Amino acid sequence: AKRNIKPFDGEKYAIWKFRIRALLAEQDVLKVVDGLMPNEVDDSWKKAERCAKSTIIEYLSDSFLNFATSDITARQILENLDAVYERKSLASQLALRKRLLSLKLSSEMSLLSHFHIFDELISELLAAGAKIEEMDKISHLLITLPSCYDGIITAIETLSEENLTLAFVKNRLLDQEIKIKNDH
Amino acid sequence: AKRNIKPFDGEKYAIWKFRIRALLAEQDVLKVVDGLMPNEVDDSWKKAERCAKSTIIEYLSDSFLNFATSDITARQILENLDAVYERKSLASQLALRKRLLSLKLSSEMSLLSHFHIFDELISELLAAGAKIEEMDKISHLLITLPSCYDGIITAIETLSEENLTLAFVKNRLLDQEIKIKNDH
Amino acid sequence: AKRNIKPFDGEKYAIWKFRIRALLAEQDVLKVVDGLMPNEVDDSWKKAERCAKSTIIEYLSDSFLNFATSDITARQILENLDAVYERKSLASQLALRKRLLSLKLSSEMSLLSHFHIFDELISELLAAGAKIEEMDKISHLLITLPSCYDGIITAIETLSEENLTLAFVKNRLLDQEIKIKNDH
Amino acid sequence: AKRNIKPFDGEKYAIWKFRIRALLAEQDVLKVVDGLMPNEVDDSWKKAERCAKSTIIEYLSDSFLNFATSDITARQILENLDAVYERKSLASQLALRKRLLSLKLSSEMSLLSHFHIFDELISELLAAGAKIEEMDKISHLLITLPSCYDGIITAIETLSEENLTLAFVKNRLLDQEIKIKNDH
Amino acid sequence: AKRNIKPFDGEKYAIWKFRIRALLAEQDVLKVVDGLMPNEVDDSWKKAERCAKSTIIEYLSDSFLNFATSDITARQILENLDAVYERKSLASQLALRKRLLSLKLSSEMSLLSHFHIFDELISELLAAGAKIEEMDKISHLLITLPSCYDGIITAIETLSEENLTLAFVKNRLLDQEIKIKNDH
Amino acid sequence: AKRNIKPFDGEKYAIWKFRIRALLAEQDVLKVVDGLMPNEVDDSWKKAERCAKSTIIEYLSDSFLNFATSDITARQILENLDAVYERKSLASQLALRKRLLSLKLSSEMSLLSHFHIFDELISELLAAGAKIEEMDKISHLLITLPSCYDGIITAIETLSEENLTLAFVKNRLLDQEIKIKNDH
């Protein structure tokens, strides 16, 4: 069907799972993955059950095709994939924290792209099972900024006390960045 | 099935948003984006919301799907994208206006590239919340031209009597550029 | 739908308009562009009205997408495009006449290609609002020929007096060209 | 939906015309091209004419749409194309025949390219109104060959007893060429 | 429809014919090629008759398009193609035997690929009208082997006397090849 | 319409076979490949056999169609392919096992390429009839690694308590490789 789904190759499992779920819901097939198992199998629950499996097999790389082996139902393929990739593993949390603490702004990288990278890393770390509050996101974001973005942070700390949200900090940093861009 | 909509990748957000809105209006779906939320929600709303969410997810890039991973309505996905790639900032408006007022046409650059740059600057101005009328756009385009067009510029400002538009001015400037190139 | 329609980029507007009209007529949608406005809007006049607009937006470049702005109906988009491009402008007529008077046959160009170029220039000039008779087309064609195609022109002038049509002149020139090709 | 028909661009008009005629015959449309015009025109004729015009416009190039811009029936578009790219000229027939009779096979050129050139020359002859039978085509192909094939040529002219065709002669010549290449 | 069918260009006619037959059977159209001619033509026998012809014309190269000439029915196109290509010609048999006797195993060619080449050559020779028994296939296969595959052949000759089939010989040679691969 | 199945060309037969089996199971066709042959054959069997044969022919290459040229059932085509590209040979099993036991990870080669090579070797082993459990595969993968992973290897063998699988071991090894690359 839709060719926008990149085949799963062990990287970015959440994106692939979300795309597969959306495509299955498009064809009124997602009820197989998350629904209620009928007591008896009907004709309606005979076509979607194999259509979902065929769609999953279609968007899987050569190495991962062993997840099916022609005997695993469509729901259990995604269950097995979740049990190995969508898992709350401490090693992944440690690796994501190590990568997050190594982020540094560079003159060749725009602020919006850096914010997007930080946001996707935060999303991955949250999907790794760890819980991050609103204040911790700001704390992680401000440590990656260079010495240029210092005084505004103070203006954020002293003045703002209730509206201190990640969106507000991002907006203030984006607004104040042009003052460095024209200053060089 | 409209494949002319390039997936959003952080570049040219206005074009992608306009294409998405037009496609949603095609399928009787735009009513959930603009309007109100009825108290009696039924299939006519659930199906439209599902179609809008599926279309937005399909036409978003893999790295940009983080804006709709959670259970977020179609309106809120577009609102989140608007709050990021269409940020309202007065300082940004002033900086972009200063850049546009100093813009000039170079000899080695054709008129089409200058028109594209001016269009990009105007799109950035409108995205930043600046309210610019079409006459102001025409004036900004005219003041960013060399003296060789000055004559026809007067013919645009004095002799023209109909409802002046940016497209007509651009076509007249292109014709004048062709005449100048033929003369030189 | 059909991908043979090049997106409109301010060049060859007549071809783009004809292709869009043909595609709309293919889907029984062209009645929106040129039809009768009903007193009340029905379900039949609810789908095509937006399908035509979506098709027009689909086959428009990024710069021209401002012609819609989500509030202009499908007929009025083409009306606005006609009012700026499909216009009887004297400047376009002068430019087309200047280009037509500069046509010269070259040894590296075949006679059929030159005839096609002259025909498309004549069609563009006619679409510019000027009226050309049958004799004027022949007069414009014969002035672009080199000194090789002289005597046959005399044979055209002295002998033919009633069947003097553009097709006859083109046929005679094509027949007589091979006499130069083998003569060098 | 038949995409094997290359859009007409002034090259190989016979192939494009044959493909268009076959496609029209597929959709019960060719009846409006060959036949007569009934006095009682109804939907069965209007729909067929519209389908033919739409197909011809779709399979014509952007620069070649000038042949059908006006309200011109499907028969007349093909007639206009025939009068241009299938012009009947006795002098053209004589020139092409003189070129074909002097044609010879070069050592550095394979038999397939020579067959293609001979086919192009024969197509140009038939387009110019020259009436050539299949036996005449076989003779023309045979006389344009070196002496190394002479033996098998005799085997074609003397030993063959069935209805000789150009395809069988071409296959026999290709087999003889393969044998000669193996020998050398 | 399906794009896996390479256009027929005078090479591998059997593959093209089989693919065309399969595609026609896919659309319930193959009954035209091989069926029973009705006494009167009905609406059912009005659409497939031209659909098969259009499909055949669609998958034919430019040179072979003369096989139809708009007057030959779909069955007769394939009949004419068979009468020229699918023919029991002694010259083709001699050429195929000459190529079969020139096969020699090379160190740069694997045994499976050589077996596939020998099998396709045997299939072509059988399609050329000649009849080959099971023993003759083995006799042709063993003559193409080098001096390395000698003793096993003796082990095949002395021991096996009833199960001496082409598949058994191929299996034994493939099993014994690795003993040369590791021996160098 | 599933275009992710690469046509069979003698390489990676297991992947192509698995994809074909999955696609057949999608269309309610796999029942003719696995099961029994009912005495009362009706349309439910003829249509399924025709669909299977058409799909297999379509997804086979042009040179590989020789396996199904004759009137051969869907089961027998797959059986013929199995008897050739999935040959059971004890000597082949021993040779592949000897090659795998001597396999080692080189410094210049990434872990992904080593995993792919190990997967190819395991697929060749399973194709040759060797019965290998998942724990044996995990052990074979672990013994083919340098000493730098030894620590985590022990953490896999001793600390792990759940049902160990090859995918989890591969993910842990990839994480350890990332950690080692970060350290070095």
Numbering used by the authors:
A (entry chain E), B (entry chain F), C (entry chain C), D (entry chain D), E (entry chain A), F (entry chain B): 3 to 186
The study reports:
Here, we show that the Ty1 retrotransposon Copia forms virus-like capsids in vivo and transfers between cells. Because Copia behaves in a viral-like manner, we used cryogenic-electron microscopy (cryo-EM) to determine the high-resolution structure of the Copia capsid and found that it is distinct from the related dArc1 capsid, with a larger internal capacity and the presence of pores similar to those used by retroviruses to carry out their reverse transcriptase activity. The capsid layer is composed of the Copiagag protein’s CA region, which contains 2 alpha-helical domains.
To enhance the resolution of the capsid region, we used local reconstruction methods to determine the structures of individual subregions of capsid known as capsomers, which are sub-assemblies that are found at the vertices or faces of the icosahedron. The high-quality maps of the locally refined capsomers allowed us to build an atomic model of the Copiagag protein with high confidence and good stereochemistry. The NTDs form central spokes at the center of each capsomer sub-assembly, while the CTD is arranged in the capsomer periphery. In place of the spikes, the Copia capsid contains positively charged pores at the center of each hexameric or pentameric sub-assembly, similar to HIV. Copia forms less interactions within a capsomer than other retroelement-derived capsids for which high-resolution structures are available. Despite the less extensive interfaces between capsid subunits in Copia, we observed an interesting interaction between adjacent CTDs that is not found in other retroelement-derived capsids. We suspect this CTD-CTD interaction plays a key role in stabilizing Copia capsids by locking down the periphery of each capsomer sub-assembly.
